[PDB]
Amino acid sequence: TTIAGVVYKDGIVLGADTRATEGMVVADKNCSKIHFISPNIYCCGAGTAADTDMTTQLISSNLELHSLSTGRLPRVVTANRMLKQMLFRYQGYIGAALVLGGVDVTGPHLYSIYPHGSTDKLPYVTMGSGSLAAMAVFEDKFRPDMEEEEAKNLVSEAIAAGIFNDLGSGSNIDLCVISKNKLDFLRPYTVPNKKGTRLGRYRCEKGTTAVLTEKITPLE
């Protein structure tokens, strides 16, 4: 797990890697850590998966409620304030390493949340287990007010370096770009890995296993 965020000259580029390890064994090869919050705000999670999931669904429900109650576009600082108040109210028991990003009336705003309730506004953040490699790539090749394809190439490069380094990282790479008007969301950004075709067809035959007791139940 290696998530990253950045702010280019107009908006926000978020990334992810979709290897859900459970301990030491690869449990998933295709997951989704970029979650919905609002039509303009998204979020990424790290660490304990179900904690991030339930927390982000609760906050997304509450902000959808608030936005429909108000009648206008949500603000990112409201999401930040709800998250930090809840995570501090749980005393750091819930582990939810969050990256928060959205575009308000004020513009693009990126927040990273550490699971006790400590938050920071930054132009670029990395979170997760392999965040150090992506933060290395960011500090190497960042400049203020980048363009779009520059930022997309940079975030792809950073998470790719995290996958070629980290052991809990490594799958196909998720991206998300938020502007004032154009929201994009892509399943495989750049698929670095292939897989060798099987060399032996180890296919079983129709009856190669002894059966003791059958049952048939028809349906409609």
Partner: protein, 213 residues
């Protein structure tokens, strides 16, 4: 506190044929959630007919390899002939028990030919037992690999499936398939696969890459 052991991982396979012994192993040497290298072959060529693989804690693997080579040279300079396979197995069992009360954290697999020219794989444990089996998979991906060799090599749990002797290139595609399939779910399977084949005519080696994840 100071912990004296660490798990470097690795995966070693062996297949005993009618007249061949194939030993293969990944070459990733790692620690925790990092990669130290992507080229470190676990196989070692002892004699003209014996290849040993060693996974687990890496420093004990290096030390054990060097001690085995030294005692091989001692046997040669005493008795004018190289050791057999079972002699190396007995000696290695004595060594692995000789540090019982501060154990090696080392899985060991010896493949090679016997004196009749047949395949023989002697497995081990960290404390010093051994047994003559036809196939073993040692290391982190042991449980990902033993039942599939039971399905293909051992012909277990099947019905109306005859027993064909295991040929050579069939064993090769087996080794390649099991390392690809185990590298999909494992975190310790390397990239470089180092396949050592022991025949009655020498030692062959072969390097096959994998996905670079």
């Amino acid at each position: 506190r100071f912990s004296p052991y660490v798990f470097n991982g690795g995966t070693i396979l062996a297949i005993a044929g009618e007249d061949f012994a194939i030993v293969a192993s990944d070459t990733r040497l790692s620690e925790g959630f990092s990669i130290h290298t992507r080229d470190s072959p676990k196989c070692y060529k002892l004699t003209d007919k014996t290849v040993i693989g060693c996974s687990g804690f890496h420093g004990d693997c290096l030390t054990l390899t060097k001690i085995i080579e030294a005692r091989l040279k001692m046997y040669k300079h005493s008795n004018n002939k190289a050791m057999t396979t079972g002699a190396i197995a007995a000696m290695l069992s004595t060594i692995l028990y000789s540090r019982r009360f501060f154990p090696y954290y080392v899985y060991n697999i010896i493949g090679g030919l016997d004196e009749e020219g047949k395949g023989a794989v002697y497995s081990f444990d960290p404390v010093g037992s051994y047994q003559r089996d036809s196939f073993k998979a040692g290391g982190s991906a042991s449980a990902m690999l033993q039942p599939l060799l039971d399905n293909q090599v051992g012909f277990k749990n099947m019905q109306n499936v005859e027993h064909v002797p295991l040929s050579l290139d069939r064993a090769m595609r087996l080794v390649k398939d099991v390392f690809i399939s185990a590298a999909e779910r494992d975190v310790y399977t390397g990239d470089a696969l180092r396949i050592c084949i022991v025949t009655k005519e020498g030692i062959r080696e072969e390097t096959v890459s994998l996905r670079k994840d």
